[PDB]
Design an enzyme around this catalytic site. Structure first.
Site, PDB file in Angstrom:
ATOM      1  N   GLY G  28       0.886  -1.205   0.042  1.00 46.61           N
ATOM      2  CA  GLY G  28      -0.067  -0.062  -0.037  1.00 46.61           C
ATOM      3  C   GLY G  28       0.751   1.207   0.127  1.00 46.61           C
ATOM      4  CB  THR G  29      -0.251   4.890  -0.579  1.00 47.26           C
ATOM      5  OG1 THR G  29      -1.288   4.926   0.385  1.00 47.26           O
ATOM      6  CG2 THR G  29      -1.147   4.019  -1.610  1.00 47.26           C
ATOM      7  CB  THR G  30      -0.357   6.395   3.729  1.00 46.02           C
ATOM      8  OG1 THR G  30      -0.367   6.914   2.232  1.00 46.02           O
ATOM      9  CG2 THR G  30       0.391   7.314   4.668  1.00 46.02           C
ATOM     10  N   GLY G 142       5.738   5.715   3.343  1.00 47.48           N
ATOM     11  CA  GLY G 142       5.387   5.134   2.076  1.00 47.48           C
ATOM     12  C   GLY G 142       5.181   6.502   1.309  1.00 47.48           C
ATOM     13  CB  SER G 143       3.868   6.451  -2.177  1.00 51.62           C
ATOM     14  OG  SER G 143       2.410   6.005  -1.773  1.00 51.62           O
TER      15      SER G 143
END
Lengths: 173, 191, 234, 177, 118, 249, 205, 234, 235, 160
Positions: G28-30, G142-143
């Protein structure tokens, strides 16, 4: 090589099918389907046959689907730097609880704890969408067979295992 | 060019391979007898493939001497696949293709296996490698039938080589032919 | 000339290995009989009391592989490690050659393992002897014994462990080549009843297994052993 | 103990016939009986000459017997195979005559690929020599006929020399003509 | 001979050839001997801090443990070797995945010959 | 003052009072059990012969390994436990061929003998500081004969003690007593090879257990042209017949 | 032993030979972790890996790598806690993860947040690949790290209670389903998931 | 008697504190032939009596040169003499090559002493049974070191070791006030050494073959005389 | 002076190796006889107990390669391992070198293996003396060798090892005409059977005969009863 | 730089290190590699005397030894051309030359380096020779050091 494998679960029954060299193996009541390189599927079949035979001999008990899932995950994390070119899929039913179980993996060993259905291999997205549009929960074993066979036919030759808790039906299309 | 052909018929497995091509040679290779009723034809990268084939021959002969009993062609094919994978674990894959033809003589059936350069084995009714593949398959898919006798298999192989010698722009050198039967391994005279 | 396993005595015999052979003579009698349609393993359980779990307590008979089993006499601690290595070797052979290991190859490997322990000073000889029994396509049903000395022999019917001589004599007197498993069972029970140091040879005093008929092998739970004992009139 | 503390303290032509083997070169004397011919750089040949000679001498002394051409050829083949891709410049011909195997010629490629054969050629001019030899060569020609054939073929290759002749007694003379 | 024994070593036979082995994952050359390197660095640190005696004792203990612990049927590692290395209560992938020749080079006597250097 | 058992006999590491190291002393006692070997150097060659000591008439006496070649110019006879002799000879041959490879010259006999002795010295620390290789000294003593462009015909007796002596004439093994005692009486600098051969045969006949015959004794010689060459059974039979004719009456 | 490297060359040859290697999963991202007045709350956009009952970890990067290294070091910390017979503390987990990820030199693509409570107090750390680490009261990985970090910095305050901690963590994840684990000193760790026929044959068993 | 129980190895002290297994090594020198060394500020000389196995054998090499500036003579065990001489020659080569420096005799003595010591503590090994006289000339002046297997290295004007060394040593003590003052004449120094050794002979008087001499000093690199070269000194 | 391999006896013997040789004599008899163009290996098999599995066991003379045969006498357990090492060496030589193992080379390797296990005190030496026979590849000269636990090996025209070796060897010494060895294969087999019957009290059922012939030809006889009848009637 | 060697009737000139036994050699190229090779060769010569009772070398034996030294790194060679000057077993002046891979050849005269292409014909265009006129010839060809080797020993001199 690279035939697509699809797993699907109804009520107290699971069904695993693959394109059709066999690509679905069983180690008791737990069925492992492996899409990927032919050499790697053969190697994984041999390796897991070895491991599960030792497990049965030492435990005097067939390996349950979740224990087998953890086994395959930990065996695929090995070779983390040399991973097998395989997306495996495991299906089965717990002998004690009777709960149907299906799981998919990446080439390194991350487990996708799916509840309804699993697909893996080439053309993954197409058959995934087709199953999503076609699947229904808690299907009967024959309805489950019809659903999974229709999903495969919409993506010949194929083999589908319809697994109860105590008996397994193997069918060729 | 390196081409190996194999046809499994009712009572025999016909293995054929093109003669080795080298500057100024005169005289077989691309084949190793693993036991009285199974022989291993191979092709691919020079040096590496023959070194692997001799090692496989040594292992199978060691097993035969150890037990005074012949290892089944299925078991031989499995061992060859496992050893090829072991070899390729450490080094870059080397272009190699192997046809393990033999007569089991316990189930009393002729069986043929092809092992690709990646260590994947498939039981086959017929097989080929190299430039032979495309053209021969176009013919074998039509003419092959498992009930054909060994003589009919030889006729089909003769037709396949007749087709290849026309498809190959080079003046083709021909192919040696060896047959494994219930009577053991044999070599043909007219090819 | 017996403090270390690496000395040949002036008479030329290994005292430390003959002592190991003596050790297994104190263990519970294991017996195996080969019939035309299967093999039967029986063993008189050595350590027993009312409180010991008689079920789920396989002390003598172990599963090395499908179509192979062993009855072990002697130090069970060594039996466990040797059997673990036997299982690993059988599965390695299956993995490599894709065929179930012929029993003789397994017996040869285990006998070489046992011998190698008699030859290196840092290792005492294994204090166990096995009665291998299994089925393979080369010779069908076959049965082997192996000693601490690392040598093995094929036997139609053999007893290993305590009071081996009497059971062996009874087997020699009673054995016939053309028996069926349903008769080898009675013969094994009779021989153990005539060889046991106990007065009755109760169902919990006995452990039993059989390989017959592609080939099924059943390690008997205490209920069926109890039924069979009365079935043959013990 | 203290040892632990102390550590921590601080053109070529060759063919076989009824009279043996004729080796014509525009040559390596492994033994009085074994006749090699190595193509490639001056460094590799001059070193592996001595190495293969040492190996063959060890084999002869240990076995008290003639080392077969096949054995020496496979020794060299294994050696150069261990160095396959490392940059060895070899093309090698190992010729010899022994009662156990008669006259035989083995060629070892730079990659270790070992080939038996009845005739072999290497160099720039191999094609002319092969095309003149193949028109008349046969097994049952005489030793003088063999030497004449070698003369004709090798002088044709030069037009388009040492002529060794190896037999049971070994290579008999340099044959500088 | 000077040439390697391609049969008794197994591992694919003459293939792979030695020259071809010189192409590896960058992390291969490090982890192949990580434990030995770390122990050597720690022993050097002790040699510098606690004098030559402490490394001597530490290495003598480990050598005595290694020399007298021969168990050809297993590679699980001696129990005391873990205590001496302070590994008695820690795991690493080298322990979880300890890692097959059927006919040559696997029997006990190969291990006896290796251990005794005989 | 009580009689008690003495432990210094056991172990190569143990000095006894007076510093006598016995396990190497007993090693040279095992030499006497071996078959007699004789060697006689002379200005025009060196000839060495050996008792074959066949155990039974069934043993193929023509395939016994008492004399071996190390190089074209060097040979050596051996006595004692031939099991160790094989390792010593293997090391000697390896050293000789390695020297020929590395320096493009024949190995000097002195250097080869030094290498063999250094190997024999390995039950303790090696000459080059090598760690000990064997638990006990060699039970074999072999005499090395060869020729070099500078030293000429020379003979060396290599002991398991790690020491060698250049011998004009030497006898080892069973009957070393009488053989050496007679060599002292017989040898002289003007001893041509032709009579050196007959002298070796005479010594063996005098000290052998049975009648001298071409199938129980054999000879070898070193020469600049011939090199190391064992004599054929016919040649040794001719020499024995000449001895019988000449030394009789 | 351990991670093998037994097919690196073969996999490279397959990659150049146009055999597409299957892609490993990502988590995932965050990720966001927020220290608060009585403990710490860790949130993630994949799973919240458990190192110890009251030491939890959120993993960015490759899913298998985090699910393996965090799992292994949770096993290590359980053995250590049994060995010393006392509760394990977050600093030990940080040190073990730092050494482990330094050993493999970042080839194990694991980016981790480790949070927990222990007899010394609540802790919150971040572990990057190849061993680099940092500490703080609030963190994000994360991103989508930037937006969540902005939300945290614009809303984080000293002494905020559990409800505010959960609200802020979930809001930061949203600005990046959402699952959050909140750990309080002296109380059980609270895991809050998703807070926001041709022929027939018979085969044996 | 009681000594017999404690001299089994060099790893056990006796109740009196003596270490018998190394006293035996020091006594091993008495088996070897006599060798004599004497020193003057300008030159240093060694004199050694060579022994031959039999009248048909060539004599032993009592004197070895390790460098153009230093050499040594030894008595005792041949297997240990070989080891120590080779080690010292290797270290001289190491000093001359890696450090571009001639190995100082004083440094060489202790460097060999340290190797000698280690054998007297570890089990399995045995003390070297050879005593050797290092002799050389360097920047600091002439030198002569008597090395004993106990690891003792001592600076001596002159000394004698080996069988019947007492007579030569007593003569050296009696003429130390003289032979040191020669200081420039090599012939006279070698002559004085020759009388010194001549006191140690019971039989087999000096001869051109059994006698061997060495000398080193300001102008003379280590040179060995034997055969006819020493006929003038006898 | 017999508690370890490393200790020489005062008379030069290594008593431990002599005790290993004594252990060799404990094993059952094994005899080999060289014919003019064939080699016969005989073995005294123990009188099988009536319950042994005759169909699969025992066979005492085992082939190491297509052309070599290795009989033995002494500890069977050690023999089963020495044979395996010899087989592995034979195949390794066939691989690394093109030619098969010379019989002399194989017996030298086996003697080295036996010697190697004698080099340290931590290992029991192989208490077995092999009797290797066969023909060199592409050759017609019969070869026979014996190996000992001491590592010694020698070539014999006819040799016996194991229990009652003296009785058989004495018979062979007075009955084997080395000047003109037996020529016909059946004549050599008759001589071998005669040699064994001098020690084996029981009839042919206790005798195992294996004949090795040139060009990788080996046959294990199962009709010695005919040969035994002729010898017994003649006697 | 460049080096030159001349072989005469009973002498040799090399235009450098003296290794004893009338052996003088030099290496041109990577100076570190050449110096390391020189040190290793001198070590080898001393070890030769040590193991082999101080027997004098021959130019051929030294040449083979240096070939083994060089070829020991055939796959990562020292980048230095090496040459030797001395006398052979027959008493004739002898010169041997080497290349990075370890070639092996004898020459009556050779020059190695950038200036070899000019020096080689400069001598050839105007070149038996007695000891003094080889020196004058080298001077015409050519600070710079000259080592001359003769049966009586080795002499070192320095010129332009």
């Amino acid at each position: 090589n690279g035939g697509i494998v699809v797993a699907m679960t109804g009520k107290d029954c699971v069904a695993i099918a693959c394109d059709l060299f066999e690509k679905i193996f069983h180690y008791g009541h737990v069925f492992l389907g492996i899409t990927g390189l032919a050499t790697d599927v053969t190697t994984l079949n041999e390796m897991f046959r070895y491991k599960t035979n030792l497990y049965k001999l030492k435990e005097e008990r067939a390996i349950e689907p979740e224990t087998f899932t953890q086994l395959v995950s930990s065996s695929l994390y090995e070779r983390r730097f040399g991973p097998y070119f395989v997306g495996p899929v495991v299906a089965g039913i717990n002998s004690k609880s009777g709960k149907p179980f299906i799981a998919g993996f990446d080439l390194i060993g991350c487990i996708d704890e799916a509840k309804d259905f699993i697909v893996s291999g080439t053309a993954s997205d197409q058959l995934f969408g087709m199953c999503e549009s076609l699947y229904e929960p808690n299907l009967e074993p024959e309805d489950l067979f019809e659903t999974i066979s229709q999903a495969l036919l919409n993506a010949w030759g194929a083999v589908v295992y319809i697994i109860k808790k105590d008996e397994v039906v193997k069918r060729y299309l | 060019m390196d081409i190996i052909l194999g046809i499994r018929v009712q009572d025999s497995v016909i293995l054929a391979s093109s003669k080795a091509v080298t500057r100024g040679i005169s005289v077989d290779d691309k084949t190793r007898q693993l036991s009285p009723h199974t022989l291993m034809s191979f092709a691919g990268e020079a040096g590496d493939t023959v070194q692997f084939a001799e090692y496989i021959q040594a292992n199978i002969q060691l097993y035969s001497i150890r037990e005074d009993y012949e290892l089944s062609p299925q078991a031989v094919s499995s061992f060859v696949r496992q050893e090829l994978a072991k070899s390729i674990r450490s080094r870059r894959p080397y272009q190699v293709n192997v046809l393990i033809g033999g007569y089991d003589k316990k189930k009393n059936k002729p069986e043929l296996y092809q092992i690709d350069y990646l260590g994947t084995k498939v039981e086959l009714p017929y097989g080929a490698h190299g430039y032979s593949g495309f053209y021969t398959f176009s013919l074998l898919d039509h003419h092959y039938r498992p009930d054909m006798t060994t003589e009919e298999g030889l006729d089909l192989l003769k037709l396949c080589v007749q087709e290849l010698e026309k498809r190959m722009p080079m003046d083709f050198k021909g192919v040696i032919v060896k047959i494994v039967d219930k009577d053991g391994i044999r070599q043909v005279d007219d090819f | 000339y017996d403090s270390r396993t690496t000395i040949f005595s002036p008479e030329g015999r290994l005292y430390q290995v003959e002592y190991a052979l003596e050790s297994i003579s104190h263990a519970g009698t294991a017996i195996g009989i080969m019939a035309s349609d299967g093999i039967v393993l029986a063993a008189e359980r050595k350590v027993t009391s009312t409180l010991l779990e008689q079920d789920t307590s396989t002390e003598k008979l172990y599963k090395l592989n499908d179509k192979i089993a062993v009855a072990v006499a002697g130090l069970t601690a060594d039996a466990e490690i040797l059997i673990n290595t036997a299982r690993i070797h059988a599965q390695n052979y299956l993995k490599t050659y894709n065929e179930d290991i012929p029993v003789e190859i397994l017996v040869r490997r285990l006998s070489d393992i046992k011998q190698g322990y008699t030859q290196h000073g840092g290792l005492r000889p294994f204090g166990v002897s096995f009665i291998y029994a299994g089925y393979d396509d080369r010779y069908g049903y076959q049965l082997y014994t192996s000693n601490p000395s690392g040598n093995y022999t094929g036997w139609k019917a053999i007893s290993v462990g305590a009071n081996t001589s009497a059971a062996q004599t009874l087997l020699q007197m009673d054995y016939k080549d053309d028996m069926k498993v349903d008769d080898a069972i009675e013969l094994a029970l009779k021989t153990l009843s005539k060889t046991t140091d106990s007065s009755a040879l109760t169902y919990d005093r006995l452990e039993f297994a059989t390989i017959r008929k592609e080939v099924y092998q059943k390690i008997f739970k205490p209920q069926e052993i109890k039924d069979i004992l009365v079935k043959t009139g013990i | 103990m203290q040892a632990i503390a102390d550590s921590f303290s601080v053109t070529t032509l060759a063919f076989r016939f009824q009279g043996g083997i004729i080796v014509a070169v525009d040559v390596i004397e492994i033994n009085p009986f074994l006749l090699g011919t190595m193509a490639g750089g001056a460094a590799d040949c001059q070193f592996w000459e001595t190495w293969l000679g040492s190996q063959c001498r060890l084999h002869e002394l240990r076995e008290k017997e003639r080392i077969s051409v096949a054995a020496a050829s496979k020794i060299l083949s294994n050696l150069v195979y261990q160095y396959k891709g490392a940059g060895l410049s070899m093309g090698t011909m190992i010729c010899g005559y022994t009662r156990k195997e008669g006259p035989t010629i083995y060629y070892v490629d730079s990659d270790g690929t070992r080939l038996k054969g009845d005739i072999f050629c290497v160099g720039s001019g191999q094609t002319f020599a092969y095309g003149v030899l193949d028109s008349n060569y046969k097994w049952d020609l005489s030793v003088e006929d063999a030497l004449y054939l070698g003369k004709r073929s090798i002088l044709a290759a030069a037009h388009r020399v040492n002529l060794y002749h190896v037999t049971e007694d070994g290579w008999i003379y340099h044959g500088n003509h | 001979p000077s040439l390697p024994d391609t049969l008794r070593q197994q591992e694919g036979g003459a293939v792979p050839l030695s020259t071809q082995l010189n192409d590896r994952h960058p992390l291969e050359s490090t982890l192949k001997n990580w434990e030995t390197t770390q122990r050597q660095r720690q022993m050097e640190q002790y040699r510098q801090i606690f004098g030559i005696a402490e490394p001597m004792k530490r290495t003598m203990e480990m050598e005595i443990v290694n020399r007298t612990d021969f168990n050809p049927l297993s590679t699980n590692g001696s129990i005391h070797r873990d205590i001496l290395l302070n590994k008695e209560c820690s795991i690493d992938w080298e322990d979880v995945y300890p890692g097959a020749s059927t006919m040559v080079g696997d029997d006990v006597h190969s291990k006896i010959e290796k251990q005794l250097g005989i | 003052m009580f009689l008690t058992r003495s432990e210094y006999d056991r172990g190569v590491s143990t000095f006894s009072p007076e510093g006598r190291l016995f396990q190497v002393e007993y090693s040279l006692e095992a030499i006497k059990l071996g078959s007699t070997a004789i060697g006689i150097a002379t200005k025009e060659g060196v000839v060495l012969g050996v008792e074959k000591r066949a155990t039974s008439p069934l043993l193929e006496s023509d395939s016994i390994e008492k004399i071996v070649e190390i190089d074209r110019h060097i040979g050596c006879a051996m006595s004692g436990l031939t099991a160790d002799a094989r390792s010593m000879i293997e090391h000697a041959r390896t050293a000789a061929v390695t020297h020929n490879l590395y320096y493009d010259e024949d190995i000097n006999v002195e250097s080869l003998t030094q290498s063999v002795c250094d190997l024999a010295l390995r039950f303790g620390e090696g000459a080059s500081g090598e760690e000990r290789l064997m638990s006990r000294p060699f039970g074999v003593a072999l005499l090395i004969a060869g020729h070099d462009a500078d030293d000429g015909y020379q003979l060396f007796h290599a002991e398991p003690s790690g020491t060698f002596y250049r011998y004009n004439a030497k006898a080892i093994g069973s009957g070393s007593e009488g053989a050496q005692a007679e060599l002292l009486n017989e040898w002289h600098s003007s001893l041509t090879l032709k009579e050196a051969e007959l002298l070796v045969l005479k010594i063996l006949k005098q000290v052998m257990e049975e009648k001298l015959d071409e199938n129980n004794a054999q000879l070898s010689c070193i020469t600049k042209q011939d090199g190391f060459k064992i004599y054929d059974n016919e040649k040794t039979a001719e020499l024995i017949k000449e001895l019988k004719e000449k030394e009789a009456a | 032993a351990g991670l093998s490297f037994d097919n690196y060359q073969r996999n490279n040859f397959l990659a150049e030979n146009s055999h597409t290697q299957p892609k490993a999963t990502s988590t995932g991202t965050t990720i966001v972790g927020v220290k608060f007045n009585n403990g710490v709350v860790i949130a993630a956009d994949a799973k919240l890996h458990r190192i110890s009952p009251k030491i939890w970890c959120a993993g960015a990067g490759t899913a298998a790598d985090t699910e393996a290294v965090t799992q292994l070091i949770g096993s290590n910390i359980e053995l250590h806690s049994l060995y010393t017979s006392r509760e394990p503390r977050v600093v030990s987990a940080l040190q073990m993860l730092k050494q482990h990820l330094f050993k493999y030199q970042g080839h194990i693509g694991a980016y981790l947040i480790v949070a927990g409570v222990d007899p010394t107090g609540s802790h919150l750390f971040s572990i990057h690949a190849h061993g680099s680490t940092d500490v703080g009261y609030y963190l994000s990985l994360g991103s989508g790290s930037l937006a969540a970090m902005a939300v945290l910095e614009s809303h984080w305050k000293q002494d905020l209670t559990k409800e505010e901690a959960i609200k802020l963590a979930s809001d930061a994840i949203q600005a990046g389903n959402v699952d959050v684990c909140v750990m309080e000193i002296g109380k059980d760790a609270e895991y809050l998931r998703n807070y926001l026929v041709l022929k027939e044959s018979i085969v044996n068993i | 008697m009681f000594r017999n129980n404690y001299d089994g190895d060099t790893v056990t002290f006796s109740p009196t504190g003596r270490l018998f297994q190394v006293e035996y090594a020091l006594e091993a020198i008495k088996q070897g032939s006599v060798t004599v060394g004497l020193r003057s500020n300008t030159h240093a000389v060694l004199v050694a009596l060579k022994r031959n196995a039999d009248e048909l054998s060539s004599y032993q090499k009592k004197i070895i040169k390790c460098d153009e500036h230093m050499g040594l003579s030894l008595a005792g065990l041949a297997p240990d003499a070989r080891v120590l001489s080779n080690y010292l020659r290797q270290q001289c080569n190491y000093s001359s090559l890696v450090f571009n420096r001639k190995l100082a005799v004083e440094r060489a003595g202790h460097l060999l002493c340290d190797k000698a010591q280690k054998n007297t503590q570890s089990y399995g090994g045995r003390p070297y049974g050879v005593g050797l006289l290092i002799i050389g000339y360097d920047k600091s002046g002439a030198h002569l070191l008597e090395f004993q297997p106990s690891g003792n290295v001592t600076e001596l004007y002159g000394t004698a070791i080996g069988a019947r060394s007492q007579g030569a040593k007593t003569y050296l003590e009696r003429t130390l006030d003289t032979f040191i003052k020669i200081d420039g004449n090599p012939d006279e120094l070698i002559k004085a050494g020759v009388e010194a050794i001549s006191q140690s002979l019971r039989d087999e008087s000096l001869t051109v073959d059994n006698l061997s001499i060495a000398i080193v000093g300001k102008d003379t690199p280590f040179t060995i005389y034997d055969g006819e070269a020493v006929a003038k000194y006898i | 002076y017999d508690r370890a391999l490393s200790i020489f006896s005062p008379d030069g013997h290594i008593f431990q190796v002599e005790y290993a040789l004594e252990a060799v004599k404990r094993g059952t008899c094994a005899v080999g006889v060289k014919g003019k163009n064939c080699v016969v290996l005989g073995c005294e098999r123990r009188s099988t107990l009536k319950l042994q599995d005759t169909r699969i066991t025992p066979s005492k003379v085992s082939k190491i390669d297509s052309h070599v045969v290795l009989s033995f006498s002494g500890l069977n357990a050690d023999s089963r391992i020495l044979i395996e090492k010899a087989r592995v060496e034979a195949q390794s030589h066939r691989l690394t070198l093109e030619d098969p193992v010379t019989v002399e080379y194989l017996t030298r390797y086996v003697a080295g293996v036996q010697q190697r296990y004698t080099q340290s005190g931590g290992v029991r030496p192989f208490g077995v003396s092999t009797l290797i026979a066969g023909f060199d590849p592409r050759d017609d000269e019969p070869k026979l060798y014996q190996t000992e636990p001491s590592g010694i090996y020698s070539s014999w025209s006819a040799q016996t090892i194991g229990r009652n070796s003296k009785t058989v060897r004495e018979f062979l010494e007075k009955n084997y005409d080395r000047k003109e060895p037996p020529a016909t294969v059946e004549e050599c087999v008759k001589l071998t059977v005669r040699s064994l019957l001098e020690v084996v009290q029981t009839g042919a059922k206790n005798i195992e005969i294996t004949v090795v012939k040139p060009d990788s030809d080996i046959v294990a006889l199962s009709s010695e009863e005919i040969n035994q009848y002729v010898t017994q009637i003649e006697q | 730089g460049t080096i030159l060697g001349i072989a005469g009737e009973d002498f040799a000139v090399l235009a450098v290190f003296d290794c004893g036994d009338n052996i003088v050699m030099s290496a041109n190229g990577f100076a570190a590699d050449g110096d390391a090779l020189v040190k290793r060769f001198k070590n080898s010569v001393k070890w030769y005397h040590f193991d082999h009772n101080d027997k004098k070398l021959s130019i051929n034996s030294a040449a083979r030894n240096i070939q083994h030294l060089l070829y020991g790194k055939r796959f990562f060679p020292y980048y230095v051309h090496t040459i030797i000057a001395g006398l052979d077993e027959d008493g004739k002046g002898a010169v041997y030359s080497f290349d990075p891979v370890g070639s092996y050849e004898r020459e009556q005269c050779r020059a190695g380096g950038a200036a070899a292409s000019l020096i080689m014909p400069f001598l050839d265009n105007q070149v038996y020779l007695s000891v003094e006129e080889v020196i004058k010839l080298v001077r015409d060809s050519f600070g710079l050091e000259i080592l001359i080797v003769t049966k009586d020993g080795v002499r070192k001199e320095f010129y332009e």
